[PDB]
Design an enzyme around this catalytic site. Sequence first.
Site, PDB file in Angstrom:
ATOM      1  N   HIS B 201      72.524  21.883  25.663  1.00 31.22           N
ATOM      2  CA  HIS B 201      73.346  22.526  24.647  1.00 31.22           C
ATOM      3  C   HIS B 201      74.568  23.219  25.229  1.00 31.22           C
ATOM      4  O   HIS B 201      75.452  23.619  24.464  1.00 31.22           O
ATOM      5  CB  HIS B 201      72.508  23.524  23.852  1.00 31.22           C
ATOM      6  N   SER B 205      75.732  16.880  23.262  1.00 28.46           N
ATOM      7  CA  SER B 205      75.158  15.579  23.558  1.00 28.46           C
ATOM      8  C   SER B 205      76.257  14.540  23.750  1.00 28.46           C
ATOM      9  O   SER B 205      77.382  14.691  23.271  1.00 28.46           O
ATOM     10  CB  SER B 205      74.210  15.144  22.440  1.00 28.46           C
ATOM     11  N   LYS B 227      66.802  11.891  10.511  1.00 30.01           N
ATOM     12  CA  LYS B 227      66.804  10.735  11.405  1.00 30.01           C
ATOM     13  C   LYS B 227      65.681  10.829  12.434  1.00 30.01           C
ATOM     14  O   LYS B 227      64.987   9.840  12.702  1.00 30.01           O
ATOM     15  CB  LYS B 227      68.161  10.608  12.092  1.00 30.01           C
ATOM     16  N   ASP B 228      65.470  12.016  13.008  1.00 29.63           N
ATOM     17  CA  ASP B 228      64.389  12.198  13.965  1.00 29.63           C
ATOM     18  C   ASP B 228      63.025  12.150  13.293  1.00 29.63           C
ATOM     19  O   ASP B 228      62.056  11.707  13.910  1.00 29.63           O
ATOM     20  CB  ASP B 228      64.567  13.516  14.716  1.00 29.63           C
ATOM     21  N   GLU B 271      47.378   2.905  36.186  1.00 27.51           N
ATOM     22  CA  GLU B 271      47.832   2.640  34.830  1.00 27.51           C
ATOM     23  C   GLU B 271      49.189   1.950  34.856  1.00 27.51           C
ATOM     24  O   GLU B 271      49.942   2.047  35.827  1.00 27.51           O
ATOM     25  CB  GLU B 271      47.911   3.935  34.026  1.00 27.51           C
TER      26      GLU B 271
END
Lengths: 51, 379, 379, 79, 79, 148, 60, 238, 55
Positions: B201, B205, B227-228, B271
């Site tokens: 921040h 972004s 949107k998220d 894994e």
Amino acid sequence: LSRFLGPRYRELARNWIPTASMWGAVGAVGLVWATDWRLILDWVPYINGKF
Amino acid sequence: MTNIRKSHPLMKIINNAFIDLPAPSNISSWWNFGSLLGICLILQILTGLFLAMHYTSDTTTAFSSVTHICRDVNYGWVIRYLHANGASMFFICLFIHVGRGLYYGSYMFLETWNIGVVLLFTVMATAFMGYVLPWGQMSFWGATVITNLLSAIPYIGTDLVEWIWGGFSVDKATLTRFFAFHFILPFIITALAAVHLLFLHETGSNNPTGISSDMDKIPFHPYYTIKDILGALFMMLILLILVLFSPDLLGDPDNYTPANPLNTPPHIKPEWYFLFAYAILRSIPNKLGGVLALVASILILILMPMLHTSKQRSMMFRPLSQCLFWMLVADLITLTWIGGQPVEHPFIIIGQLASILYFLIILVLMPITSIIENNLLKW
Amino acid sequence: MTNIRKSHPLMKIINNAFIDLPAPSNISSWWNFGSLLGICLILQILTGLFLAMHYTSDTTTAFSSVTHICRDVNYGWVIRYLHANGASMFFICLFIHVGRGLYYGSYMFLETWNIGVVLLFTVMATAFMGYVLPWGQMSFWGATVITNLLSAIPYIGTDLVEWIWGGFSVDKATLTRFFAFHFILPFIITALAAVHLLFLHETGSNNPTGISSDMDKIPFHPYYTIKDILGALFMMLILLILVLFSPDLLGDPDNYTPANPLNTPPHIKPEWYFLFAYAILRSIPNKLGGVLALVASILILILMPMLHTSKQRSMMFRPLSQCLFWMLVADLITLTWIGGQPVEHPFIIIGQLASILYFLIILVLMPITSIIENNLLKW
Amino acid sequence: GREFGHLTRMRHVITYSLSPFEQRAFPHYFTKGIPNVLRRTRACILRVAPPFVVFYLVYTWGTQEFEKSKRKNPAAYEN
Amino acid sequence: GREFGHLTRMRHVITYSLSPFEQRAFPHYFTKGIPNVLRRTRACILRVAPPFVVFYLVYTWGTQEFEKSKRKNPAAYEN
Amino acid sequence: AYAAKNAVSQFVSSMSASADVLAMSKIEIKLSDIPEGKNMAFKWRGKPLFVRHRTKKEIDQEAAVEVSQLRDPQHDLERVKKPEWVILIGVCTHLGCVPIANAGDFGGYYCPCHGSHYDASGRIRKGPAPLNLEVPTYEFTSDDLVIV
Amino acid sequence: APTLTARLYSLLFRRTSTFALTIAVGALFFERAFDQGADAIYEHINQGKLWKHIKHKYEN
Amino acid sequence: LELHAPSYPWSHRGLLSSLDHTSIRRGFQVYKQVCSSCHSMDYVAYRHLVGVCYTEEEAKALAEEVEVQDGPNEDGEMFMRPGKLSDYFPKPYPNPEAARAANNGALPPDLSYIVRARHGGEDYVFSLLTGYCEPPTGVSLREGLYFNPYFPGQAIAMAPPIYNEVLEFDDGTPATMSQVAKDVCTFLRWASEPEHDHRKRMGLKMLMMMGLLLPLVYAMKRHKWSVLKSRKLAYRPP
Amino acid sequence: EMFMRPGKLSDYFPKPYPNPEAARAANNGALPPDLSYIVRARHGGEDYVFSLLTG
Ligand code: HEC
Ligand code: HEM
Ligand code: HEM
Ligand code: HEM
Ligand code: HEM
Ligand code: FES
């Protein structure tokens, strides 16, 4: 809290009582639905078919 | 009078972080995964907590406790497989997020990128120890191999390995250490993520074009909150598919047998999200060289900002760099596939070539190609 | 150029929190305990973590694991008794901190005071659940009694207590649940303490005079970092005295026998930092009334700011209020002593009188005395 | 810090917008999306696909070679 | 917000200080400290001690009364 | 809301009693393993359960107890089904301590935590206990078997 | 002649409290109906395989 | 070289297909009458059969049919009890060393997670049970070993456990080797995944809910973003 | 098959009875308490143990 004792505040309470009652109904219905109380849900016609 | 959302301290922090945050309007779906990561983290805590209410980190009861969770606890199977597949989803989102950062030049946020590298290492350690927790054959022997890797360190390797083990090999002491560390690490990850968002921040972004978007900023809330939420819904769809139709797809069957210190399983592989590193580790015949290559495979992200030689930030306008990036992605897929495969004739040579190509692309080919593009653009 | 300390984001936060924070120049030693609390918290996080590397939360291996820590783990007894007595030091510092807040009118910081009350509740729950982990006689039976308290809640009491138990009584399910909750809660405590400091720094800190000290603010670092270091050294001296000379001074010996669900210990009582509440709980013959009195005995701190009827903030210039405050402190000591003692002829009546006096002093005598003091000063 | 009040200096830019309740959420969704999706795919295919095609070729060759290597060699048993 | 520079307005207050390397860390520690401690103790002893003295009296009586209660009552075993 | 309710309900239900705990809800006691005049303690529901094979003399004395002179009016015949068998939950009503069998002044149970005295039928006789020891629901499947 | 959606907005969706009450009641009834329908679909797909389809042959 | 099991068309391999609880009951009969003598299922109790293939009374009857060692009595020595549905399936041998001694040094694995512990699962188990064959020319098996092409190494210490009429089914189904193998593999799949049917039902419910929600949340996002996606911007320098 | 061996430092002090029920049977229904923490589990500790033994 004597500041909030006046005709205008009584008018405010009159105005917001329907909204408070609606929100209380929302809370009661949400609680009954989430907990599946079945003390109240037995009365609901279609829902009481469950269990 | 004032606005509580803008004046109250906690409300100030929340508003400046998630409500009134100026966000670029053109950021694509590849910017969702960050938030997705957070969701995964939160899930990996909640689910994880409800696994700790029944798991006991004792060699005589760990496997039995896991079977109790998946056999007796109400919806215990849901929680257990949500945890297991949510780890894989976490690493999918991590890989996609790092790929987004590499592609769109998001690593120019130096502090954010470095905190992200630290987060990646912490999450990898957490997932490793969590996988050791069930104490199956796969857990025990993967822990044995990965911890034995540290023995390659010169002059302190044996002492360090035996200190981490809490003994002479992987045993009850190591299992309890790993349970405690696996419990505690995700909260350190949350703190590091808070610092990460704090650093992000500071400059806002990035965006697909790689161009400053201060002329076109929108409030984060009305647009990117929904949107998220949609992105989280899609991620939850994929995760629930994996947990309700193929709960054992990404796992290994040999982890359903109790750990046998006297009998190795037919194949010992970690894994899937570690396989690529494992593959690189197996390319170098030397143990110390293999460990160093494995560490550098992740530490190269630190060098990534310094290797940037192009005049443009994002790869959106650099077709040759895009080709190199997709070659790198295919190379990582090759490394994962080989890490799955045994150590035999074709796999050894393909893995060596793949590791060489990975380091060559990240170190040599990309800066040279960026310089070539700069010369082609007359600057 | 700039200053990294005053420019870098994390450095900005740290500098504004602990380096260049304007602090009153006259805050006495009673303002050390705050920092001490943090110290204690960190200690409990570190020490406890090292106990989690050897502790297993199964009823068949809990007491044995604790004895393994105390006998076999290198310096395991040091860590175990550090944890056990550091909980007691934490509660000593917490009680002194709350007393300082009451005496000097620090509750006028409404948000800070409320976050502190939440912190007190969370720390009490953490300690209560942690005391069950050794799975001794006292742990099992104190857990039994305190949890059975919840059954007094009308209608949903039985279902709630059985849900918390994980079964029909305190058993392996309860032990594992408590271990998980005990592990996770201190991190929530750290987050709440960070929020607490955030709220506090919004208005600075109070001073013994109770008068705004903006004219006589000093930098926090050179003075109060060394003062808090000295306070932490003295606290560490007392804690190490407890750990190394009387490790079992504050612990009942009956907790060194393995839990016996079929036989009660001769006397059942919680740890000392709960006894006072326990005393109030036993003052009311009614179960629900007793539970409500227990809850009110700590929720009264919420009411504290609203009962402040004095024109002056601190009790420094309020001798009658000082007398009432010291009566309250002596009453709390009496409640602790009675909670330690059994339920017999003199103790019942003295405890009932002590509970009545506690609530009367906090609710009735203090505001009336403050009004009388205001009259005597012709306010 | 960075706040909507002061981010950048912009002049003489006019933005016309519509209320969400005055416009359709999916206007010409298919008839415009499908050509646009095809355009984006045509633009990005030559950049994305070839590395994965090469990976698939390498994967198939490696699997075939490993399977052949596991197979018996007749020449080892001539005698 | 809360930083040195805008906390308050103060005028015509002159402060004189000294370097910590030019002065003694314990100036008259006992010659003036001990009388000062006695003054502070005297001012507070009549506001802090009396409540705690009451506790001691109650504690002693309760302990004695509890002991007496457990003692044998000869009259109960008479006849 | 539907999805969130399902998720939260599943997470909450994971914390309730497990399948095995519910499996151990009610137990089987073989009466032939309890000799006469012996109060056996069993782990039931995580708490002590007292099953005493009350003797004929004890049955007679319990039947002779003055009902009205009891803090909680109860009759032995209404307290237990079979006179020679008395089943009680070993949790004192006063605070919740475990009474010790054949220790009180009445030959029944004695809670030492404060001093509660119960008879062989669980009825409170002396001490601060407000009520009598709870009698769980049970039935005799056979002559020498009981399910609680 | 208001449409159905106009009637819905005027009666329920205009005020947020009534909006939330409608959401809660709809959540209750939708949960009931959706569970019933999904159970019916699942049991039809696995007809003759589930225990509830064969329990009668063993019940007493 | 190793042989991979074929993909048999199990009735539970469907996307939303459940298990045949009749097959589960038959497979449990196979387990209690064939492999219980040497194999064990520690993590499966009789109470787990109450809602799957046997009613509660039938499960109690099954539990009471096998004696179980109980805790110390008054004298302090262990005794035997008829058994109850709270008990788990009996261990054929006390400790693994006894099992190895009784099976020529080979430990019969626990069958509670066998289908989940082997690659191929029920396919591998079915191919193994019915795949016993005479060893090909060149194969020399040690004493007490049998040639099974699907077992790794092709030399398995388990003699062919099932054959025609090995057990008589209560249901009356013909007891062919294939039928017994299919039923026991279905039962072992149930043992490995006792939540199979519930997981399938929840998966169907979540598929329906996601198909309902994803378009709706997508429409909400489009509704919010319509302001920006229809936004027309013009540049008007003086 | 279980068996007996001479014993080693790694072994803990042998139990007198296989289970607490056997101890109660051999001691008139009273379980002889474990002495590993007996001084630390009794109010009085070594003082109480000494007085109990000698009184
Ligand atoms: C003759 C005693 C015996 C019988 C009866 C028996 N088993 Fe086994 N089983 C064994 C032994 C011994 C092994 C391991 C042999 C080895 O590892 O070499 C084994 C192994 C297995 C394996 C494969 C384990 C692996 O590692 O591949 C499966 C599957 C299995 N048993 C299931 C069954 C089933 C299903 C039945 C009933 C049809 C059954 N068993 C009956 C003794 C038996
Ligand atoms: C980023 C966060 C986390 C990651 C990546 C992670 C990863 C994993 C993985 C991969 C496993 C293996 C599960 C399996 O194979 O069955 C596991 C197991 C486990 N984890 Fe974590 N985990 C995280 C957070 C947590 C937290 C916060 C807790 C506790 C508060 C926790 C507790 C457990 C437990 C108890 C197990 C064993 C239970 C089981 O295996 O089913 N985990 N974890
Ligand atoms: C638990 C791990 C992580 C969490 C919780 C997390 C969280 C986030 C979030 C919420 C964002 C904002 C959304 C976005 O911009 O996409 C973000 C952005 C970013 N993250 Fe992460 N992240 C994690 C791991 C990483 C890693 C591994 C890296 C790099 C190796 C990284 C580097 C970045 C960068 C550079 C950005 C800014 C992207 C841009 O502005 O274009 N993060 N992160
Ligand atoms: C405010 C923070 C904490 C408080 C007040 C607290 C308090 C306590 C107390 C009173 C005990 C009982 C010790 C005894 O009776 O011997 C205990 C035990 C224990 N605590 Fe903590 N604790 C805290 C934080 C933690 C943390 C953060 C962890 C792990 C990361 C932890 C792990 C343990 C363990 C494993 C035990 C059992 C070991 C033993 O009893 O010796 N605790 N705690
Ligand atoms: C884990 C628990 C707690 C921690 C870590 C903590 C920490 C702190 C710290 C570091 C300070 C600043 C130093 C100081 O003023 O002495 C402070 C101040 C303060 N605390 Fe807490 N505290 C805790 C619990 C509480 C409780 C239980 C209360 C009240 C019931 C409370 C109320 C306050 C108030 C009013 C202040 C400001 C006092 C003043 O500035 O004069 N806190 N706390
Ligand atoms: S606790 Fe039982 S009589 Fe007091």
